Ligand binder design. Sequence first.
Ligand SMILES: Nc1ncnc2c1ncn2[C@@H]1O[C@H](CSCC[C@H](N)C(=O)O)[C@@H](O)[C@H]1O
Ligand SMILES: Nc1ncnc2c1ncn2[C@@H]1O[C@H](CSCC[C@H](N)C(=O)O)[C@@H](O)[C@H]1O
Ligand SMILES: CN(CCN)Cc1cn[nH]c1-c1ccc(F)cc1
Ligand SMILES: CN(CCN)Cc1cn[nH]c1-c1ccc(F)cc1
Lengths: 352, 337
Amino acid sequence: SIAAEREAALERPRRTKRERDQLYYECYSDVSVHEEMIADRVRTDAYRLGILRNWAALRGKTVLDVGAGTGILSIFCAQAGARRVYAVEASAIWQQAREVVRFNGLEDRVHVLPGPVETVELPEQVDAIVSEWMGYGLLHESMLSSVLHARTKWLKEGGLLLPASAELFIAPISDQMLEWRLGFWSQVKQHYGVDMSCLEGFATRCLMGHSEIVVQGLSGEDVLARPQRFAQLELSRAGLEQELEAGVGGRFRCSCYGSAPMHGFAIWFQVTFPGGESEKPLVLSTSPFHPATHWKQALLYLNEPVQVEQDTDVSGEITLLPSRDNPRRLRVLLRYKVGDQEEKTKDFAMED
Amino acid sequence: TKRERDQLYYECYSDVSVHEEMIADRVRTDAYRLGILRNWAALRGKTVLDVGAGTGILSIFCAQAGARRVYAVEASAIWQQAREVVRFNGLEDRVHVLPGPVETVELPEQVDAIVSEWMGYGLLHESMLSSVLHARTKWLKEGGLLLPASAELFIAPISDQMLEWRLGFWSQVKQHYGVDMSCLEGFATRCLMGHSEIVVQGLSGEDVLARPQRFAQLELSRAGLEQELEAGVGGRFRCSCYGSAPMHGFAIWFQVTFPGGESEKPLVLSTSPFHPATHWKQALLYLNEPVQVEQDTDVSGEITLLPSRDNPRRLRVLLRYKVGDQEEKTKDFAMED
Ligand SMILES: Nc1ncnc2c1ncn2[C@@H]1O[C@H](CSCC[C@H](N)C(=O)O)[C@@H](O)[C@H]1O
Ligand SMILES: Nc1ncnc2c1ncn2[C@@H]1O[C@H](CSCC[C@H](N)C(=O)O)[C@@H](O)[C@H]1O
Ligand SMILES: CN(CCN)Cc1cn[nH]c1-c1ccc(F)cc1
Ligand SMILES: CN(CCN)Cc1cn[nH]c1-c1ccc(F)cc1
């Protein structure tokens, strides 16, 4: 009755969250998002090889695949020699995953289970967990909590986690697409005979003055200083679920290579698969120096461009967290200082 | 309500992106450029109304063509940028920028010519043509010039090779990953073809399966044209296919025509897949799933373009069609978000 009233107090927020989660899972009910993920060969091959590389530890064992999607990774586990895979999926796509499993003659080895991993009922604890949970800037979507919840509740003592860790990186960058778009108004006179160079200011406010994280792929030569690691996440680390709510990040400092128009920062990530005593640990990287992936990079624009020079000092602080309104939307708090300019603040939220 | 439909519409035109896109659209901007300049004899010393002047570029084309006065009317916040561009080009006493919707603007005089780039996806998306016709009736002098003067709509059955590759993707998964996912073709089809949305995507001429059929001609000088827009524009079509293909649906596109001047050759701005690409691309009307056609497969039906009930600016397409001897089918579309 006091107990009853306490439940009645949490009923409203618990329902809002259920409704929110349901909108998020729907983001994965359509073909395109899976098409994109499986066409991403770097992503998909890193998982396949990461799994394969651990066939010795997986032979005859059991696996939980958190967010099975179309079932692909679960099937990788089955092919690696796993006795049993529980393919858990909260989005309507679990139906396609079930179809793929049956079509591949694997319905005895892979069990597709609908609904959230947080409330799924497995018949036993598992020897390994596999999950592709990473969002833009690693933490967009906030799926990691789900994976950690599954670990604490269902992974056997000393069990395997694929992947096992993640690292976050930041570098000052120059966006060539952005530069072209800002410069476009100065080109109008030469194409059509009307001087529109006075709109550069306006173009800059629209395209750089907003507070959204932008997903764009850059290449090596857009990076204006040595990339700095700013966070390391060891997935097995006790109560890391709390660290997430409070923010993950760190401070950074670096020195620019040379003359360049600086537009802001790129952040990206990598995840590491533990290796068997075969081949060693396999890194899946989303770096602009490395083969492109569907995550690209997450771009954080300064309000306007800043010219940097060789040995220009760039430092600051970055923290990744949930947005106030949408816990599944990535927020980035950026503190930064370029050259002799004063320290500045920008508070970004993931592009819809 | 209605107030909030317009905030969202004009907010998009308040921002740089759509203007960069229209202006980087070379086929579009150079058609207006040449179209305007070749009507110098109609424009020199005359007065012009630019309906929806945006950044003011076409108004400036008009002034460069000799107009003594241009009224550049713009309902979004971008009117500030247009006034700046006008000042910067020393054109403030030739071009006057006026904020607000053309429906309620007051000009100091009736005009000799109207210019406007009012066309949306599938021609009528955004429903801006009302505004131009409203301005013609209220402000254009008897016998005045309209740039462009007319519009035409076209339809053709299509096989969209890019879509075909997206449907066939699932059959290629085994080759590279060792998992057979070819059983997901059905699901891919329902996702990419089974919805009711008009898709703005660019096609190749090689995607066109039959001779394109004109299904509407819009003569802008015609009183009464206003009232038809509400009934719907369109009518029947029929054509016969070139060869074997999986037909995915139909593409529609449009052209607009600027009268020739003294030089006397009309300039046509086309959005056909047989012509250089524009930012309008083509508007795609996918059937629920592919249908196999052969050479001389007859394709017929009826198409209506009209505004949605709940949102007057959102294009709606009502399609009725018959492929070969297959039974007649029906499908309703609304413009993509
Ligand atoms: N709490 C939760 N429980 C179960 N599934 C979840 C979840 N949160 C997210 N998901 C699912 O996890 C998937 C992540 S992406 C798809 C990964 C898929 N295994 C692949 O590699 O292709 C989505 O399908 C999403 O619906
Ligand atoms: N009823 C109305 N009154 C005034 N402007 C309008 C309008 N409906 C749409 N517009 C404006 O008309 C423009 C259409 S597109 C911009 C065209 C610009 N003349 C160019 O060719 O680059 C937009 O700027 C839009 O805000
Ligand atoms: C980011 N990847 C990998 C998720 N593990 C999913 C994806 C691929 N394309 N688009 C998405 C996506 C993007 C944003 C979402 F909220 C959900 C999915
Ligand atoms: C469709 N064109 C030309 C309109 N005269 C404007 C444009 C360019 N990019 N995107 C748009 C656009 C698209 C949809 C809208 F509701 C408004 C503008």
